[PDB]
Amino acid sequence: ESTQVRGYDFNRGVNYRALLEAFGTTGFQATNFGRAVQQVNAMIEKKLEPLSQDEDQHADLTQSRRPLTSCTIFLGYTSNLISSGIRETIRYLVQHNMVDVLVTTAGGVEEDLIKCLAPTYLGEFSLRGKELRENGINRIGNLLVPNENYCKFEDWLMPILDQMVMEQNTEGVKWTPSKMIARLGKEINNPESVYYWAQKNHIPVFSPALTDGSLGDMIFFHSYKNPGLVLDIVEDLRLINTQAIFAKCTGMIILGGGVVKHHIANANLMRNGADYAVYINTAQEFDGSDSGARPDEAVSWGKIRVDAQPVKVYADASLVFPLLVAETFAQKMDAFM
Amino acid sequence: STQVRGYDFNRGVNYRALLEAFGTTGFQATNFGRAVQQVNAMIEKKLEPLSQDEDQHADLTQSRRPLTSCTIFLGYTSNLISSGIRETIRYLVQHNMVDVLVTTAGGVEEDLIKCLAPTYLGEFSLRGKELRENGINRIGNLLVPNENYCKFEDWLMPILDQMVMEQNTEGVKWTPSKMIARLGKEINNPESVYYWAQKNHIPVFSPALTDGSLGDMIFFHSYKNPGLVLDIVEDLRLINTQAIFAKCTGMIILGGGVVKHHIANANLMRNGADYAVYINTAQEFDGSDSGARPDEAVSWGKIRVDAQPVKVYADASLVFPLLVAETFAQKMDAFMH
Amino acid sequence: STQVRGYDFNRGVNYRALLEAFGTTGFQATNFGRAVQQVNAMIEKKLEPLSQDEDQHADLTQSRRPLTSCTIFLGYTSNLISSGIRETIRYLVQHNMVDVLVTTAGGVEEDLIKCLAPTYLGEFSLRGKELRENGINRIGNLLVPNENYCKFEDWLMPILDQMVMEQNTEGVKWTPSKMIARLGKEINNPESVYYWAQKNHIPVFSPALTDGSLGDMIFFHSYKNPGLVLDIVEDLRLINTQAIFAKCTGMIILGGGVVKHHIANANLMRNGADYAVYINTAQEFDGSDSGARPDEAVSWGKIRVDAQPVKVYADASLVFPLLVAETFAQKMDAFMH
Amino acid sequence: ESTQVRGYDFNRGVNYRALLEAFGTTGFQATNFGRAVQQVNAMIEKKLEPLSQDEDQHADLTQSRRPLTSCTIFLGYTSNLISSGIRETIRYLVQHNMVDVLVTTAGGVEEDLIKCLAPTYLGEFSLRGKELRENGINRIGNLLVPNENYCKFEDWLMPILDQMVMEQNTEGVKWTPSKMIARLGKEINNPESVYYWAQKNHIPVFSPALTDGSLGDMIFFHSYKNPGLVLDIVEDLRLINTQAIFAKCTGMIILGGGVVKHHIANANLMRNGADYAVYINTAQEFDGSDSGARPDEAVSWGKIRVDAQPVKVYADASLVFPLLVAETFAQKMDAFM
């Protein structure tokens, strides 16, 4: 039962599918990439298995309109990836109903909406903050966002916050982050937006610290003009946890660390663990942080089943997530239509 | 022009002189020395008296806590509360040396649970399957038995019953910071960070408080005693007002994620912190907020252009007790009376 | 001003377009795109003809290898030769696409041994005790049986006997580069990097060649057949002359340590490389040469001030086959005839 | 058999010895630091055990004048640490004959000598290479070295290289790196120098790629004025390996990665493994590099005994090595005099 190390032979010419396939026998993180392709393809193939359970009960127990499949896939990603071109990548998966639950941080919501109003630009990591600040330019890694983008966001968002307060106070709406994100996706009304497609396809988005970013800034300023908006995080905890509890199987695809990683993993502890899991991040374990914990720490908690074969790829997801999608979801497009 | 020179142990082991020599040793030892200077600048500023004019503006908050000349925000990730840095943080809070805490849910939880049962030393390499089979959970190279959370459940559930009763019959509008104050009062134990925080009127912000064991318990509680609301909007106003009406601010941030961003974003509301120290092991190259250098925050206005912030690239379990030894602990008499 | 935009999989899986889209995706995907541009600039320069004047100066070396308009230095660490990147490197060397190799001792050794027996896939977490008890050596997530080195001993010892004989009776003055050429000729196998390097007159520098299995064998051999000398001074002249008399130079450096420094230092002798790509996962914060950004080398004169060098922060087992696919492999016809 | 997590209580005041002792129960890398203190103290205590073996045989078999002790300690460190203030730290250990073998890279030799002629200065990592180069300033991390330092080095070194060539050609001297380093230490004749003390105390220094740096540049330029110097690496392989083979016990203290780490570890494979080992570095395992390999990879090779209890501290050695020395060697100063 032994596989030999061998890399792609460019004497064959350039066949990119064969080149990507060769990662599996190349070693180090290339091999982990091949293992991740296999784990995600196992999630997809399980998802496509037919099932025959009670539609109305499920909906009652989860308080969700989304129909159950044979594998509930949780996709988590940090804010920076929505500032990156991986935004397109994630939007594709959600547009085609390929995942079931989204978890991201506040920036990961608002920068998708802002990109429908104005673009993000390429820059460099080493650009100095004094000069950028003096020019009204904000840096995100090697990306750049002008202050004017947030001005356009403000103008777009304040009338929606007005309606939200009115609906809460006179139509009994109890706002949560996931409910707000669904509404913003409907309002942005733009097929380039992740959250437009999420609400159209009844994919919920959880973001328990939704106030930590520009949407927070705007909610804050808005509240001195139109007081009273409340965002409850308790009901959203019930919604995410019941997505895990009532699943047939679950898979986790987690890009980055922080709350998005922990929140997906903790939901899956409710069912004594995910059946499949892929982490892609650059965090290291040695400082004891949750972000840097290997999948095998999650096993000790019951967040990943002891019989699962989870995979971590240690790499920037801007490089590896498009390749992963290319070899997995994008190959199964036939079945998602 | 300062020359590189390390401590000369031919002098013997003079600990203070050895620590002072980090400044001229280079690499992260020099950044450690710069961090000592930055924190001592925050303390020196904090102990200036407020002028009449400054006192007027600073008094503009409804906070019970007396205002000082430098409001210090201390942020830390959950793993650090599982570590012995819990004692370091507790000491600072106990003696009113910082003014605002920001942490994640684990960072609240695990302080309270340590008053019920201890955390143990283990190894990073322990395998999740065998740990899970023995009911032992791993946090880096630390270990918490399942039983710890059983005791937490027994302790917490009667409090949740009281909180719901107070909500529904006494008009209480819970937020994360108000719950954390109450949990600190209930734990009633001088070893607890949150006990001292509520005693000293130090607010604790944790916008994703539902992401861990507290969340598990609220979740199960919601089925027997439904309706608890935790609003994050009111807490956003509260943390942002702490920054807006400060005479000066300092940020001391251990780790990344929400704690780092939430503190920094609040300080953007005053066009930047005056002083800032980051201690973490995250790298910038993947674009993550966690790995962003202080100079990225300058571009946003989260750190003032004329500030001299510092990042120490190191595990805070090593650096933070040394930093406190060289700064706050040296001025303890000033924080007493 | 280039806008951020990721590949849109609604277009289908067009691999070339997906790779081209890394440039506008951000973070390290953008650095990957910049690295493709840098390497293609080296190749475009290499394929310019030499003017009369340039030909005159470049001809000033005693190298059998025809001079070109860009001398490309390729450096890589030993682990990459244990990986399937050995095939990638072999292809470039086979088709004369680079001009100078620099590696460590393992980087020589393990190429030769792979012609005698394979390397296998394993896992990073396998425990050393059980591996040692089974005579299995671990390299990251790769595995080499002890037997591999027995075969290497049987192969190498008769060659060492001949080298000593040629030293003592034919005046040969061995250096690392001369031994590596001889080992490549002896292995006589088209799967070997060093076979093709000596066939194509590509010198290989490895100033610490005694640091691994070759060293073990020289050591034991020294007791039966004493006196072998390996001079590193002559090799220093040889590598430095490759830089000094180049029309232009490019550096492609995979990993850190001696391979990175030795290539960069040689190029200081011409006041800097014209083009440079680093691929590695080292961080700058500990001051290590391995983690130093290209811009540190600019301060020394190792990279020209007007160059646009690039570092991709990633495991080269993922990135380097993609880089070659987008650069050298696209111009293969130009390197043939 | 369980130890509870507890940090230092600053309500005790500031006792730095107690603070450092508390690292052991603080967790994460603080705990690994405590384990490293224990491993190095075990090396020292073993070294001090008396022994009673044949003095003349030992010297014959090792071709060394250094007397055997009960534990042979190998100390390795990368170049950057000699540019840092850790130079003083290492010099102290060698001055007092506390370690037995030194391994470093070329920069780690020459920058100790240059510091006896002119100092290294503090700077910042972010200083731009163009401006530094235009001012004749070279950057090493956040340290700075003027070009003039290398001019002074040249003037000092060229007459010594003259004598070395003369002694080789007319007194039969066969130069190796360790023999050259001993001579340079004798010539520098300055008690601030590591290598002055090493040669005085008959501590050999191995550096198989000694030509990779400024000493190489100078040897290179010198050879066009005074040709013929040869530096053999084979005889130095015999000297380092016999230090391991004939030891009673061995310990490895390795700061950084690269050749210094591999070369010490490979020598100890000759005796089927070191009895004690401490690594301090910031390299990560996931790219398969030797630098980032955990001690447990070395166990699979036989480089560390299966019954050893090695320790890696993941941290910048500029921070932790002075603390480690303070708690170990500097406490045992009594016995080394």
Numbering used by the authors:
A (entry chain A), D (entry chain A): 27 to 363
B (entry chain B), C (entry chain B): 28 to 364
Text from the published report:
We have determined a crystal structure of DHS-SPM complex at a 1.69 Å resolution. The final refined structure is characterised by Rwork/Rfree values of 16.17%/17.93% respectively and accommodates residues 26–363 of chain A and 28–364 of chain B. Likewise, in the DHS-SPD complex, the electron density for two SPM molecules symmetrically bound could be observed. SPM is similarly anchored by its N1 to the side chain of D316 and additionally to E323, but its chain is slightly bent in comparison to SPD due to the interaction of the secondary amine (N5, corresponding to C5 in SPD) with both K329 and H288, and these interactions prevent the occurrence of a nucleophilic attack. This interaction directs the remaining, uncoordinated part of SPM (C11-N14), to the active site exit. Noteworthily, despite the similar location of SPD and SPM in the active sites, both SPM molecules display significantly higher B-factor values as compared to SPD. The fluorescence signal for SPM is significantly lower than that observed for SPD. SPM activates DHS to a lesser extent than SPD, and its significantly higher flexibility probably excludes it as a substrate.
DHS (EC: 2.5.1.46) is a cytosolic transferase involved in the first enzymatic step of the unique post-translational modification of eIF5A. DHS catalyses the transfer of 4-aminobutyl moiety of spermidine (SPD) to a specific lysine of eIF5A precursor, which results in deoxyhypusine formation. For its catalytic activity, the enzyme requires nicotinamide adenine dinucleotide (NAD) as a co-factor. In physiological conditions, DHS forms a homotetramer.
